[PDB]
């Protein structure tokens, strides 16, 4: 496929940024559950 | 040049090495020089010169086949990235493994292994192949 | 239907002398589909329709489509241009090597 | 048997009125025919109806044949098949 | 406008967006509840503590992954999308019931949510069986919620694939005939036919366990003279029939990736796949008690139960051998969605050789109820999907939104997934093959090594299901918009651009007879 | 009903050559190993004369008048027993 | 100096599948010989081993003596 | 011109191994985990009646 | 009409590429988190 | 029991369950050749820059790859059935044995000559002697004489169970109202272990099987003993 360059350009920081957020979006929550798992027992 | 995308049900111009001729030639406006260029080609192509035809060349296509089938570096990227990420998994398992997981049962003590190893023995656990199979009961060891 | 009754058709087809710039591509496109390089006399009849259409640059193309057509088999394509040499220096066709064209 | 029963030349509207008078005339403004194929050579173009300046084609290009090829067709100069050759002419509006 | 767009459409392509991103926020729910049945197995002992909750746990994982994940997105979220452009119709024959089959899904959901939060869940198996799933073993409302659940969710797929068999018979253009229609667009009619005939079949077979829990029926309680094995099979009449719903559609992509990757005009063997597929639809309704070797069934049946069972593997490898030769002179494109296309034929033909050794009803004996049947189906059926959803996701994602995947994080992306999920599943046919059962929350000590293996695999797919959420959104962050996409001749899906405009084929393609 | 197809669309010469061929066939096939497989003689039972069985009111008017049309001396018995 | 020969043109994947489907045949005929060999008939040989002179009477004497059961001393 | 990969390339396949050949050595060796693997060979029998 | 084309045939908005990442975040964190509070939920009661 | 780091089946305890081993080994065998072969061959449909892109006739290649695959098939159907028929056969049991599943544990009734039954429960872990197995030792075992043929029947008091050994090839569900058949022979005195195989609530995990082979007139002494 052929595509135009970025209309928004996403930088190496950029992505790490994102990369950082989308993981620890997923990991504190069930992270926080499991860690406090003994507490619920 | 410029492709557009309200310019998608147009005939379009690719680089594949299976479709060697595409539909359209890469450049379709030509200049002054070019236009010479283009009428020069209708005399015998030994007149023109090697930059000429290069020339001629670059306006019909856009890679030559030797650019569009070059090998790239990319595998170590994505091969590298893909074990940075498989480490990463490591770090998640050593913080399930420490804040997450209690002590596993008391049958997994090294002297609970070692009676319950004898008394599997004693059974004849998997006798044939198995298990006992592999201690030797003459002599009182794991057979070599 | 045999080899040569195949090239034959193929060496018919690009000696049409009024063959069309569409007719050309649609033979060179459905041609490397196959699961050969074409004969050097097929490949002769295409340069030769480049010729009659002032298309210098899909004479040259095609020379590559024959190299990589072949694939691994490296002496292929140094014997098709061995046997197009009098065609190429007549019609003054410069190989993709020559052209640099060949570099990455 | 009585009346009483309002008959489509009667009743029929909107599009299914379209479809049922253009029907009586021979017409098929709203597609539901396939169109019969003409010999597609250059001088005997399929001609296709279009109320733009271009239409999808698609070229079933030997009977039986499970592939289509599909491409627009343009207002314009005639077109071929890129599998087959036969040509095309968008006759618009 | 919002309003009117996305909770009143009727249009083909909008409520294909809705089920893509209602599957995709089912996959997160279920990828978790995959996670928990791992923690508790990953190590021996016990890690909640409630075995009950376990239970729950591996009921919802697999409801939600097979009822809310695969399902909305093959047939509703690619089906909606890509059949009406396949055949060149201006949408789906009935639009508007087609939002309601998407709408039935948030409720359908929310039910089952709603199983899992009121008294101790359904721990009952995705099976459901009674007596375990009735009013005396499971008192209260947790089961007649999840038989609700599976009530909306059957109403909405009826309801989609009479939708869908309507479509693909009345809308192609009239010099098409089947036979001139594509691959994937046979395989969600096949899958829709299997639906309209197998979802009654399971929604009688709930709705008589609803009775007997709330109307004193008996028809699974031998005290009234009712039997359980009448319940298991009803629900496998139904649940082969399904299981063959959930991977048909990964075929029908399957050959059009592999088909695009090859540079090909089309798939090797057309009518010979469409035999494949027609023989596999009609061969899943006689098979079902190949789940029930273990109930006490005489022998003559075991015998007529293993023996057509194997016959399915006959058409099924015309389509894994077809493949191979749509591959073979391929110009190959080494895309990602081509790596997730070949690592469906790799995963899918470990699995459903799995599934030939369980054919044997001999073999089955020991086999059944343990992690080898686990491993059979997370190969040919779960990954399976997985991989065909991927795969069809990375190639038609530029269609859907008109933007580019970055193809170096895709295929890292497929990489990282390939490794976590053999290395989650492999070990289970060791586990399997020496007798671990399956739906258990601890296991004797000896299973341990595998057991921590498999649990290890799955935080690696873990963390590629969280770089694929960083993947799409990087995508609509940087907006390279698509130009030119390859082989519209053989794709017409995509030759009104990218994405399409909202009506398309609004003058419908010219096609005559010759 | 309980099928599995779909085509429908219409049904031609191509259709009903694709059911003779790709299902009906087969069937034929497969129930032609089935079968010859589930061939071999069995061993006959041992005789008794039941009245039921065996019927003469009226003598066969072929052969002895005993021999049924189609008789097998291995697996059908006179009304005195099996034939030696 | 000299003219390059004229190579075979014709044909060149199909004459690779041709010869790679036989090599492949015959790494499939050279494992299962070796299987069969390593797996299949080891065991019918361990099985047939173990069972030649097995004696179950002193097999059990010895599971006694060692304690193992509830319902012999 | 060069892209990323030839920049980079090396040094991502380099430190991405050796992050992961490490990291996962630690796991599985350093924090406890018990693999329970085969005592033929390892285990000397105790006497347990 | 409606609108049409890239970053407008979707029920979200693509506009600001970090209000994307927050959107996305809480529509996929979400459904992950989901089942660790039920889990934590049922655990509660006992 | 299995034992750690097991690959394949338990030893077999039964003739039959030999019969299986040798009959997976043959699948196994067969299942290899096809995996291996596939491999190869989608190895070398990738491999090469050499096309052929245009239309393929299949009918020939369609024969060869519908009938090498029913082949393969009916070279694992015939023993398979064989095995099938044979684990069907008569074989006169000396001893009829009945067990009910019942959450979450088994009972045991042998009731050829007097009413002897009992409960069998998991000993739990804390309460393992040395060396002891964990979730697999019961209370009470199901003490049988080797070397014979016996009858168990497998019914339920509540909701489904399944009474399962793996080493003598055995797995048969526990339904109520229903009485299922299957039999068992033991070549070899010892204990043999299996686990409940249909899922019946929050201690599935934990209703094990524990099997004792012992001579007949041990066994005898044995039922006399727990009247
Ligand atoms: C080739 C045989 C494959 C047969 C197997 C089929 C089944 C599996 C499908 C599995 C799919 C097989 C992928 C084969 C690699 C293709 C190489 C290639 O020519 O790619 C195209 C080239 C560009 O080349 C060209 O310009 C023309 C060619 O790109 C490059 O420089 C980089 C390409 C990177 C691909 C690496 C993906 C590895 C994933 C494998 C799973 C485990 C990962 C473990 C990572 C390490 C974890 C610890
Ligand atoms: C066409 C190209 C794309 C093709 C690719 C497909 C895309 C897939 C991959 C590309 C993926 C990109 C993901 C983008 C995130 C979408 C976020 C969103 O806000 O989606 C759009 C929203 C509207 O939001 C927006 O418009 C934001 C922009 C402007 C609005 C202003 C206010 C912002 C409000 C806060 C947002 C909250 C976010 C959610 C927060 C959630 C909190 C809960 O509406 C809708 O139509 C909803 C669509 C259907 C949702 C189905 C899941 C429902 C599951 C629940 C079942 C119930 C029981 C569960 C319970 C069961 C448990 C057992
Ligand atoms: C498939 C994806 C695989 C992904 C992971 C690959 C790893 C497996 C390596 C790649 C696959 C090879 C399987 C290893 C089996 C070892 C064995 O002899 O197993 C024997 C039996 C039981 O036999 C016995 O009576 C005991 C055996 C004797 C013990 C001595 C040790 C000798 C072997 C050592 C194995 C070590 C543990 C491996 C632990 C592995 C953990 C992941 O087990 C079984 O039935 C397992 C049944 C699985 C059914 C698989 C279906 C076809 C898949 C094959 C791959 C495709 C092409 C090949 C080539 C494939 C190349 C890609
Ligand atoms: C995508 C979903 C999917 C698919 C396609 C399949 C496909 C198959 N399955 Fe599986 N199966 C499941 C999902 C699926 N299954 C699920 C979820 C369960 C368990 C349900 C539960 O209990 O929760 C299950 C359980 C299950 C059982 C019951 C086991 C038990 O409970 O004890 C059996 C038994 O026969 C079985 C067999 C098969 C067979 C023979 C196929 C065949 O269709 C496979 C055919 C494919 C091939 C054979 C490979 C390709 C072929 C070649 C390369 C050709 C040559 C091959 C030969 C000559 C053999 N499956
Ligand atoms: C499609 C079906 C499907 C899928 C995908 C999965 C995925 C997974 N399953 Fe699944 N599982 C079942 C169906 C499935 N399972 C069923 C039917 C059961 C039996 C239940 C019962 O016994 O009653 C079961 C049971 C089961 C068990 C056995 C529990 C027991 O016996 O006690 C285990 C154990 O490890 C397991 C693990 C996993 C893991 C680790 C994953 C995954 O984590 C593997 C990696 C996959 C992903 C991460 C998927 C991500 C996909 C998306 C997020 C969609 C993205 C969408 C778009 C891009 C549009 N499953
Ligand atoms: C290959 C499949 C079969 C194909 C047909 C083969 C021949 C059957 C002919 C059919 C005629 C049907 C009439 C039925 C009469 C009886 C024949 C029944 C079929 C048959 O052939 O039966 C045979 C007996 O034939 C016998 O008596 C002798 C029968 C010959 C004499 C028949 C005389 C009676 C005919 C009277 C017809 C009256 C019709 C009136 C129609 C009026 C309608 C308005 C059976 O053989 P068997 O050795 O006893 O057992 C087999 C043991 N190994
Ligand atoms: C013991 C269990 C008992 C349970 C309860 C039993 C109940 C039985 C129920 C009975 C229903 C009775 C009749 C109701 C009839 C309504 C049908 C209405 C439509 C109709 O009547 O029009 C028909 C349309 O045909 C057409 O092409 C129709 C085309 C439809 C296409 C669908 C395609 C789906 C895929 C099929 C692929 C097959 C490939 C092989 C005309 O046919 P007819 O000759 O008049 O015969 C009708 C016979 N009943
Ligand atoms: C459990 C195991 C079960 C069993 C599995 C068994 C697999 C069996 C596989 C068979 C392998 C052997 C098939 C060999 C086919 C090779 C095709 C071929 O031999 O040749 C190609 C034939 O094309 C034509 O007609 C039509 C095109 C070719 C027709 C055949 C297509 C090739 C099919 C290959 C399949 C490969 C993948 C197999 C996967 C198993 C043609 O090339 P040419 O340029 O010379 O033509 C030019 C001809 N002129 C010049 C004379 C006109
Ligand atoms: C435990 C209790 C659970 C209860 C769950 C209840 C769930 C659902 C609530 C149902 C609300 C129904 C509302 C009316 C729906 C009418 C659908 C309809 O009539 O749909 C029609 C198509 O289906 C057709 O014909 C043929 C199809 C008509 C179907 C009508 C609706 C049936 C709904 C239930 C049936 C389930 C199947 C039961 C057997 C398993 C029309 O299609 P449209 O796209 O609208 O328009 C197209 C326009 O061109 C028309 O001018
Ligand atoms: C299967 C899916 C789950 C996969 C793995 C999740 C990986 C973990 C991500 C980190 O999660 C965080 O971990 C912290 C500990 O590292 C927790 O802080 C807890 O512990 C801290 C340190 O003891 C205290 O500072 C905090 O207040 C206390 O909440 C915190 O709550 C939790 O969000
Ligand atoms: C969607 C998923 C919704 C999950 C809701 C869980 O809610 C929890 O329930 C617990 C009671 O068991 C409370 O104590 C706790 O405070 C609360 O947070
Ligand atoms: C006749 C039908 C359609 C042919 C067509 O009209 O194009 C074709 C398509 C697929 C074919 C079948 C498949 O190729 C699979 C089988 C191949 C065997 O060689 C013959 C039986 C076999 C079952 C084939 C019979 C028949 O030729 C089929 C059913
Ligand atoms: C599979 N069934
Ligand atoms: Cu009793 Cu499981
Ligand atoms: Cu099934
Ligand atoms: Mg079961
Ligand atoms: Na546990
Ligand atoms: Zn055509």
Redesign the pocket.
């Known amino acids: 496929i052929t595509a135009k360059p970025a209309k928004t350009p996403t930088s190496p920081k950029e992505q790490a940024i994102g990369l950082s957020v989308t993981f620890l979006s997923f990991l504190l929550p069930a992270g926080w559950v499991l860690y406090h798992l003994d507490n619920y027992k | 040049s410029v492709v557009k995308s309200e310019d998608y049900a147009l005939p379009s111009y690719v680089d594949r090495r299976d479709y060697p001729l595409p539909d359209v030639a890469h450049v379709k406006n030509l200049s002054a020089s070019q236009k010479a260029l283009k009428e020069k080609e209708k005399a015998s192509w030994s007149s023109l010169s090697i930059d000429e035809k290069v020339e001629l060349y670059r306006l019909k296509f856009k890679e030559s086949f030797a650019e569009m089938n070059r090998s790239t570096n990319e595998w170590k990227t994505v091969v590298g990235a893909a074990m940075f990420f498989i480490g990463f998994t490591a770090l998640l398992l050593i913080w399930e493994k420490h804040y997450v997981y209690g002590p596993i049962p008391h049958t997994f003590e090294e002297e609970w292994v070692a009676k319950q190893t004898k008394r599997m023995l004693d059974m004849k656990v998997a006798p044939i192949q198995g298990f006992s199979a592999k201690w030797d009961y003459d002599k009182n060891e794991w057979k070599k | 239907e045999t080899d040569e009754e195949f090239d034959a058709r193929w060496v018919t087809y690009f000696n049409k002398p009024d063959i069309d710039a569409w007719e050309l591509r649609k033979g060179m496109n459905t041609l490397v589909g196959y699961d050969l390089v074409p004969e050097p006399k097929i490949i002769d009849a295409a340069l030769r329709a480049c010729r009659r259409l002032n298309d210098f640059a899909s004479a040259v193309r095609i020379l590559e489509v024959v190299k990589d057509k072949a694939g691994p088999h490296k002496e292929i394509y140094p014997y098709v241009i061995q046997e197009l040499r009098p065609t190429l220096n007549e019609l003054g066709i410069s190989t993709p090597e020559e052209l640099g064209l060949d570099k990455v | 048997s009585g009346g009483g029963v309002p008959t489509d030349e009667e009743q029929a509207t909107g599009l299914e009125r379209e479809v049922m008078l253009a029907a009586r005339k021979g017409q098929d403004p709203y597609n539901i025919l396939a169109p019969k194929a003409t010999s597609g050579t250059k001088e005997d173009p399929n001609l296709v109806p279009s109320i733009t300046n271009k239409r999808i084609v698609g070229c079933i290009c030997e009977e039986d044949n499970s592939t289509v090829i599909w491409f627009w067709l343009h207002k314009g100069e005639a077109q071929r098949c890129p599998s087959c050759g036969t040509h095309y002419k968008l006759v618009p509006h | 406008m919002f309003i009117n767009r996305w909770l009143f459409s009727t249009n083909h392509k909008d409520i294909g967006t809705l089920y893509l991103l209602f599957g995709a926020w089912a996959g997160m729910v279920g990828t978790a509840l995959s996670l928990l049945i791992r923690a508790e197995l990953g190590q021996p002992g016990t890690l909640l503590g409630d075995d009950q909750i376990y239970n729950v746990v591996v009921t919802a994982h697999?409801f939600v992954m097979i009822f809310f994940m695969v399902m909305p997105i093959m047939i509703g979220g690619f089906g909606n999308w890509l059949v009406p452009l396949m055949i060149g119709a201006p949408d789906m024959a009935f639009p508007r019931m087609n939002n309601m089959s998407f709408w039935l899904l948030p409720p359908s959901f929310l039910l089952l949510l709603a199983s899992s939060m009121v008294e101790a869940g359904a721990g009952t198996?995705?099976?459901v069986y009674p007596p375990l799933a009735g009013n005396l073993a499971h008192a209260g409302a947790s089961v007649d919620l999840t038989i609700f659940s599976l009530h909306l969710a059957g109403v909405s797929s009826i309801l989609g694939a009479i939708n869908f068999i309507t479509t693909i018979i009345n809308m192609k253009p009239p010099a098409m005939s089947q036979y001139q229609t594509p691959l994937f667009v046979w395989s969600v009619m096949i899958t829709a036919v299997l639906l309209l005939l197998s979802l009654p079949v399971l929604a009688a077979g709930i709705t008589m366990l609803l009775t007997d829990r709330n109307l004193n029926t008996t028809f699974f309680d031998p005290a009234g003279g009712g039997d359980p094995i009448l319940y298991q099979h009803l629900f496998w009449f139904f649940?082969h029939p399904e299981?063959?719903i959930?991977?048909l559609p990964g075929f029908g992509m399957i050959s059009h990736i592999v088909t695009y990757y090859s540079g090909k005009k089309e798939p090797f063997g057309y009518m010979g796949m469409v035999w494949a597929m027609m023989s596999?639809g009609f061969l899943g309704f006689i098979?079902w008690a190949?789940?029930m070797?273990?109930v006490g069934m005489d022998v003559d049946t075991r015998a007529y139960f293993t023996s057509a069972?194997?016959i399915?593997?006959?058409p099924?490898?015309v389509?894994?051998?077809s493949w191979l030769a749509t591959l073979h002179g391929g110009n190959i494109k080494w895309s990602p969605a081509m790596m997730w296309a070949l690592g469906f034929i790799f995963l899918?033909?470990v699995?459903?050789?799995t599934?030939?050794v369980?054919?044997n009803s001999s073999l089955?004996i020991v086999?059944?109820?343990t992690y080898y049947?686990v491993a059979?189906?997370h190969y040919?059926?779960?990954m399976?999907?997985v991989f065909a959803i991927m795969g069809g996701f990375v190639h038609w994602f530029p269609l859907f939104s008109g933007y580019t995947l970055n193809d170096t994080w895709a295929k890292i992306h497929f990489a990282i997934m390939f490794v976590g999920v053999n290395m989650t599943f492999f070990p289970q046919h060791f586990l399997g093959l020496s007798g671990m059962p399956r739906r258990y929350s601890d296991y004797p000590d000896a299973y341990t090594m595998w057991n921590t293996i498999s649990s290890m695999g799955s935080f690696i797919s873990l963390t590629a299901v969280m770089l694929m959420v960083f993947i799409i959104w990087e995508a609509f962050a940087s907006k390279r918009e698509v130009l030119t996409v390859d082989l519209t001749t053989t794709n017409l899906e995509w030759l009104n651009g990218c994405p399409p405009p909202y009506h398309t084929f609004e003058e419908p393609t010219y096609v005559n007879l010759k | 009903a309980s099928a599995a197809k779909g085509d429908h669309g219409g049904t031609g010469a191509r259709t009903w050559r694709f059911l003779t061929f790709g299902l009906a066939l087969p069937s034929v096939a497969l129930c032609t190993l089935n079968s010859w497989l589930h061939s071999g003689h069995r061993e006959r039972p041992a005789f008794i004369p039941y009245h039921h069985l065996r019927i003469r009111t009226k003598p066969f008017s072929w052969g002895d008048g005993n021999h049924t049309f189609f008789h097998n001396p291995r697996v059908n018995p006179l009304p005195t027993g099996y034939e030696k | 100096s000299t003219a390059l020969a004229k190579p075979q043109m014709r044909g060149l994947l199909a004459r690779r599948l041709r010869f790679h489907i036989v090599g492949a045949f015959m790494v499939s005929l050279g494992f299962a010989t070796f299987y069969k060999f390593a797996v299949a008939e080891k065991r019918k040989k361990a099985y047939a081993d173990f069972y030649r002179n097995y004696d179950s009477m002193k097999d059990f004497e010895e599971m006694r003596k060692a304690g193992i059961f509830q319902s012999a001393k | 011109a060069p892209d990323f990969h030839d920049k980079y390339g090396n040094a991502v396949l380099a430190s991405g191994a050796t992050f992961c050949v490490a990291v996962w050595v630690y796991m599985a060796t350093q924090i406890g985990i018990e693999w329970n693997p085969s005592p033929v060979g390892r285990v000397t029998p105790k006497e347990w009646r | 009409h409606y609108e049409e084309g890239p970053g407008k045939n979707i029920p979200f908005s693509v506009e600001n590429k970090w209000r994307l990442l927050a959107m996305m975040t809480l529509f996929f964190g979400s459904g992950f988190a989901a089942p660790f509070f039920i889990v934590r939920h049922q655990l509660l009661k006992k | 029991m299995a034992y750690p780091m097991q690959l394949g089946f338990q030893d077999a305890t039964s003739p039959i369950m030999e019969e299986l081993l040798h009959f997976h080994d043959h699948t196994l065998m067969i299942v290899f050749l096809?995996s291996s072969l596939?491999l190869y061959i989608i190895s070398l449909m990738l491999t090469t820059k050499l096309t052929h892109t245009s239309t393929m006739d299949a009918q020939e290649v369609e024969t060869i790859?519908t009938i090498?695959?029913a082949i393969?098939?009916i070279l694992?159907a015939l023993p398979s059935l064989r095995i099938l028929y044979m684990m069907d056969e008569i074989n006169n049991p000396s001893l009829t044995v009945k067990t009910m599943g019942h959450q979450w544990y088994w009972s045991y009734e042998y009731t050829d000559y007097e009413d002897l039954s009992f409960d069998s429960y998991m000993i739990p872990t804390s309460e393992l002697k040395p060396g002891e197995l964990r979730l697999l030792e019961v209370d009470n075992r199901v003490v049988l004489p080797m070397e014979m043929t016996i009858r168990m029947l497998v019914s339920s008091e509540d909701v489904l169970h399944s009474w399962a050994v793996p080493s003598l090839g055995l797995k048969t569900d526990a339904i109520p109202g229903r009485l299922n058949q299957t039999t068992l022979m033991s070549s070899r005195p010892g204990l043999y272990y299996g686990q409940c195989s249909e899922i019946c609530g929050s201690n599935h995990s934990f209703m094990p099987i524990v099997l004792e082979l012992v001579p007949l007139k041990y066994f005898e002494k044995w039922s006399a003993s727990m009247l």
Request: aromatic share 12%.
């Open positions: 697999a198996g995705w099976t649940g299981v063959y959930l991977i596999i098979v190949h789940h070797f273990t069972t194997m399915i593997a006959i099924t490898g389509k894994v051998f899918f033909t699995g459903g050789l599934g030939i369980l054919a089955d086999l059944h109820d049947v059979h189906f040919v059926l779960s399976g999907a | 096809i596939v790859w090498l695959p393969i098939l694992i």
